[PDB]
Design a protein around this nucleic acid. Structure first.
Ligand SMILES: [Zn+2]
Lengths: 141, 38, 131, 136, 94, 130
RNA sequence: CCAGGAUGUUGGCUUAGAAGCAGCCAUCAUUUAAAGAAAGCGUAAUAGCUCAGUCGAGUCGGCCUGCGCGGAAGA
């Protein structure tokens, strides 16, 4: 809403609270602490559910801590426990591989109340159904 | 620069200019693209 | 590139048909603004993220000309951006007014509320209208 | 290289190259390399010219060779007096008249066509021009 | 469809034909039906662009000579030895 | 030769022999044949490397490790510096010690520990036979 | 020329990590005047560059052809 001012985004999942092997000191080398990623981070994360890769802005000024506001995570994390399989595609397009559907990912991408453009629950609804088929999957809509 | 009868525009920043009567290739992104004798 | 004749006739023909049913069409200057700001303005007016669009003085001139409208050329000087309302009370002037949060007015050149022309010194009058 | 696997004769006279060419239109592919100048193409020039285009197109499409040497050339080595019998065949050439469809290509875009023949024409001694299949 | 303005020739032979190719023109001939052949001299450039279309060899043509539209069809065409030009085209009354 | 499980399934004894000496040798040839038969491959030691390089020569140490055919695991931030963790063939570590001190005036330092044995790189697998 | 050059989305698989910009695929949608699941450089991955309303009438590049240029350095 202003301009550039620090805003990285590197995570693996909502479960791993401030990991190290995946990233670690990579999530805090300019203004973020490789420790406070559990205080302000899990400030409400453990109050809901930890299992969905949820990124987040940084926003740093010069007041030690940071005021990062977590938001809706990628819609791809819903293609492993909300769409179907978690991986294993075998062959790209030489095979239809898997297949999603209409009802599927319908009320899954609807929960989003901090993203998506246009409230039209028909244009912003199918906006999260393109990739679900871009991976060789069939369209049962 | 590399001088040789043949001179062309390698990158898109190339320019075929004629000075005194000799074709040259000026560049502002790679000194290696400098040519002469076109 | 450019747009073919037939492809240009429709563009103006459309913006004209929507101007005949538009209950409002305020004009203002939007230079030096960013997308995050434009979007924010679009989110405020309509959750659809669709609001406030930039158009040339020409596309608008012949659009406002293709429809029985006069005395608006002064509103088309250089960078021009239109904001119409095809539905609901055209009292959405307060939204943009508060958005610009400017102590002046100039930016909001003019507008046309319910087929009634209004200068820049009237943008506040409508922006201060009670519920 | 390209050369007659068998010939009724080993040697042949000079043979002047006059008149125009026959193969001017493409009747095998959609594109092809046409000749413009006058001269003769050796087995090496033809082969080398084939590799160029065939390489610029990876392993897709198909190429044709309308031309063919079928003409032996004799030459005498150094330190050899004139006469003493006709020289020995060293290589085979092919008379190319202005308008001789040298090569042809099909199964690939038109853009990739010129590029392919462009790297092959540079191998040819005479000038060439790009042509496209025409109806009738 | 394709209107081609033409003019009856006043002299035949390779000599005249060549003089035509040296003035953006080329020899032609319209044979067919019970009518007798007619020497025709068409414009190079004009026909050079008309033959560029495949519809020129498929659809019927209309040659206008001395105030007369004769519906003919491209039977055969002789192209230049190596240059993108035309030498002579045969038309058939149909 | 290491990392292999050997099993015995069939055999027999004969008219005069049958001795600890006989079957001792009988086992030798069996192994030689098998190792050469089961697609042989080299195993080089991979080291765990931690490179501290200013805060400014950090990005330079990373790029250098990537070129050494190593595999970055992730970089840790220490003080006003950075610690880069990665695996790299003790083989290919060849001169990193000094190549690293050269791009840091010595600013950087590093520690190396053994981690595990992995299967070599085809190119190197040919140079070994002799 | 001064401008803008966005959003779903860091598209899915792969991978140490690939986010337009190794590589397999896929290439729909979107708010629009317009923005490719992306031209070239650049990153370790990001970042950062960046190509594809004003001014007010001219601009873009293939074909045939004339005349020239470089290619061309000897006692
Ligand atoms: Zn250059």
């Amino acid at each position: 809403a202003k301009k550039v001012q620090a805003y990285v985004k590197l995570q693996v999942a909502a479960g791993m609270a401030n990991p190290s092997p995946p990233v670690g000191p990579a999530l805090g080398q300019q203004g973020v602490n490789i420790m406070e990623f559990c205080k302000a981070f899990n400030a409400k994360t453990d109050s809901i559910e930890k299992g969905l890769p949820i990124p987040v802005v940084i926003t740093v000024y010069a007041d030690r801590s940071f005021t990062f506001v977590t938001k809706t995570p990628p819609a791809a994390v819903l293609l492993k426990k909300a769409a179907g399989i978690k991986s294993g595609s075998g062959k790209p397009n030489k095979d239809k591989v898997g297949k999603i559907s209409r009802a599927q990912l319908q009320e899954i991408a609807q929960t989003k109340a901090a993203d998506m453009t246009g409230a039209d629950i028909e244009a912003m609804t199918r906006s999260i159904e393109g990739t679900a088929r871009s991976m060789g999957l069939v369209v049962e809509d | 620069m590399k001088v040789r009868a043949s001179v062309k525009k390698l990158c898109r920043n190339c320019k075929i200019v004629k000075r005194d009567g000799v074709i040259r290739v000026i560049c502002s992104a790679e000194p290696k693209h400098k040519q002469r004798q076109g | 590139m450019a747009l073919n004749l037939q492809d240009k006739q429709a563009i103006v023909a459309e913006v004209s048909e929507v101007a005949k049913g538009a209950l409002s069409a305020v004009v203002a200057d939007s230079r030096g603004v960013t997308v995050d700001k434009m979007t924010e303005l679009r989110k405020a007016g309509r959750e659809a993220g669709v609001y406030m669009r930039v158009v040339r003085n020409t596309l608008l001139r012949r659009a406002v000309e293709g429809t029985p409208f006069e005395c608006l050329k002064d509103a088309f000087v250089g960078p021009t951006l239109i904001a119409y309302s095809m539905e609901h009370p055209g009292a959405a002037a307060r939204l943009f007014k508060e958005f610009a949060k400017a102590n002046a007015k100039f930016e909001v050149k003019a507008a046309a509320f319910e087929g009634e022309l209004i200068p820049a010194s009237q943008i506040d009058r409508l922006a201060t209208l009670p519920t | 290289m390209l050369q007659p696997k068998r010939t009724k004769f080993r040697k042949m006279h000079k043979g002047r190259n006059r008149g125009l060419a026959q193969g001017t239109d493409v009747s095998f592919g959609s594109f092809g390399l046409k000749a413009v100048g006058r001269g003769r193409l050796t087995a090496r020039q033809i082969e080398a010219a084939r590799r160029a285009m065939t390489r610029a197109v990876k392993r897709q499409g198909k190429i044709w060779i309308r031309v063919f040497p079928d003409k032996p050339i004799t030459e005498k080595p150094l330190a050899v007096r004139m006469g003493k019998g006709k020289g020995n065949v060293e290589y085979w050439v092919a008379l190319i008249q202005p308008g001789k469809v040298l090569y042809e290509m099909d199964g690939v875009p038109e853009e990739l066509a010129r590029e392919a023949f462009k790297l092959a024409a540079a191998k040819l001694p005479i000038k060439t021009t790009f042509v496209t299949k025409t109806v009738m | 469809m394709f209107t081609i303005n033409a003019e009856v020739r006043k002299e035949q032979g390779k000599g005249a034909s060549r003089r035509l190719r040296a003035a953006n023109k080329f020899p032609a001939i319209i044979y067919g039906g019970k009518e007798a052949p007619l020497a025709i001299e068409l414009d190079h450039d004009k026909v050079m662009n008309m033959q560029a279309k495949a519809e020129f060899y498929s659809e019927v043509l209309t040659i206008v000579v001395d105030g007369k539209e004769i519906k003919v069809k491209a039977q055969d065409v002789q192209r230049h030895p190596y240059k993108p030009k035309l030498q002579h085209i045969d038309f058939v009354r149909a | 030769v290491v990392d292999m499980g050997i099993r015995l399934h069939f055999g027999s004894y004969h008219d005069v022999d049958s001795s600890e000496l006989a079957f001792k040798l009988a086992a030798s040839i069996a192994f030689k044949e098998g190792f050469k038969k089961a697609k042989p491959v080299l195993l080089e030691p991979i080291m765990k490397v931690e490179v501290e390089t200013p805060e400014e020569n950090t990005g330079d140490v990373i790029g250098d490790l990537s070129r050494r055919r190593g595999m970055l695991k992730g970089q840790e931030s220490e003080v006003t510096g950075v610690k880069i963790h990665a695996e790299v063939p003790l083989s290919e570590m060849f001169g990193y010690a000094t190549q690293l001190r050269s791009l840091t005036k010595g600013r950087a330092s590093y520690t190396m520990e053994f981690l595990k044995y992995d299967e070599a790189p085809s190119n190197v697998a040919q140079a070994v036979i002799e």
